[PDB]
Design a protein around this ligand. Structure first.
Ligand SMILES: C[C@@H]1O[C@@H](Oc2c(-c3ccc(O)cc3)oc3cc(O)cc(O)c3c2=O)[C@H](O)[C@H](O)[C@H]1O
Length: 290
């Protein structure tokens, strides 16, 4: 069943079905049945949203890590604004994403080159850093968290998404393959854990394989902690360099962990061709158009 993790903002106003007016019912391909609704009251009164109703899903609510700012839209993020349960149903109120699709659906269809990956990772880097500024730490950022809009640009979900099944429940069940060593350790971690996951995403985009993978969770964990990564030699020196710097096991040494954070990554030679201002303005075309 789907577990949805809602990272609630500081002054969040709780909601219920009565705060929303139904506008339309849509079939959105990979998104299934989506209701278009309008918020009736509150700070966001009159705002249009998508609503998903999930029959059998669990909701986990988590605090973000800490001026009085009202949030505005980021070009490469879709947000979960409200999540609430009723008589056996989970309601999700989300940014409306017309004609959206799954990154996975695209990764299964194409063979990415380094040039392709530069675009997607650059948009993802902007999104991830923005979430960090909002106080969100992903932990197990993975391809399931990555959508594409109708124009083919990245939309990173600001909410967690996972599959959970005599068996005891856990507050955090993450996909091990994408977790940093310090996360697997349960010893404590920061947003620098997510830059490791970013590297895993990059490795998988470039190679179609995961860098650390065992026969079972236990083994994969051992590999993340101790395995010597065999770096694919077909990768450019710049790609190899970026991956090695993201796959530092001691988070203090990992690219993106310094005071400048994402800037350490933006400055890396792998991304030298990217104009970050043009990118943010959505003035660079995606390599693949759905
Ligand atoms: C919660 C998800 O809702 C639906 O897909 C959507 C997703 C999504 C799909 C697959 C993923 O791996 C992650 C997310 O995201 C949305 C984001 C929005 O801002 C608005 C939406 O309507 C969906 C949206 O309708 C689909 O029903 C998915 O099966 C379900 O898991």
């Amino acid at each position: 069943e789907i577990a949805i993790t809602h990272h609630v903002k500081e002054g969040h106003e709780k909601a219920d079905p009565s705060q929303f007016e139904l506008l339309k019912v849509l079939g959105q391909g990979s998104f299934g049945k989506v209701f278009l609704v309008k918020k009736i009251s509150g700070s966001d009164a009159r705002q249009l949203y998508a609503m998903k109703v999930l029959k059998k899903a669990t909701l986990k609510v988590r605090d973000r890590v800490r001026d009085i700012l009202v949030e505005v839209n980021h070009p490469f993020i879709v947000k979960l604004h409200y999540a609430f349960q009723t008589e056996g149903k989970l309601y999700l109120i989300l940014d409306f994403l017309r004609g959206g699709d799954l990154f996975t659906r695209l990764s299964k269809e194409v063979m990415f080159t380094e040039e392709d990956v530069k675009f997607y990772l650059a948009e993802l880097a902007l999104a991830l850093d923005h979430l960090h500024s909002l106080g969100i730490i992903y932990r197990d950022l993975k391809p399931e968290n990555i959508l594409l809009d109708e124009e083919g640009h990245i939309k990173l979900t600001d909410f967690g998404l996972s599959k959970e099944s005599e068996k005891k429940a856990y507050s955090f069940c993450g996909t091990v393959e994408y977790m940093a060593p310090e996360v697997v350790n349960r010893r404590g971690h920061t947003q620098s854990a997510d830059w490791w996951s970013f590297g895993v995403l990059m490795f998988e985009m470039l190679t179609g394989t995961l860098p650390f993978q065992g026969k079972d969770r236990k083994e994969t964990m051992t590999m993340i902690l101790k395995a010597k990564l065999g770096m694919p030699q077909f990768l450019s020196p710049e790609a190899q360099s970026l991956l090695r710097m993201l796959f530092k096991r001691n988070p203090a040494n990992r690219l993106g962990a310094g005071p400048d954070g994402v800037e350490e990554i933006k400055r890396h030679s792998f991304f030298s061709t990217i104009d970050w201002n043009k990118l943010y303005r959505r003035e660079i075309h995606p390599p693949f158009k759905p």
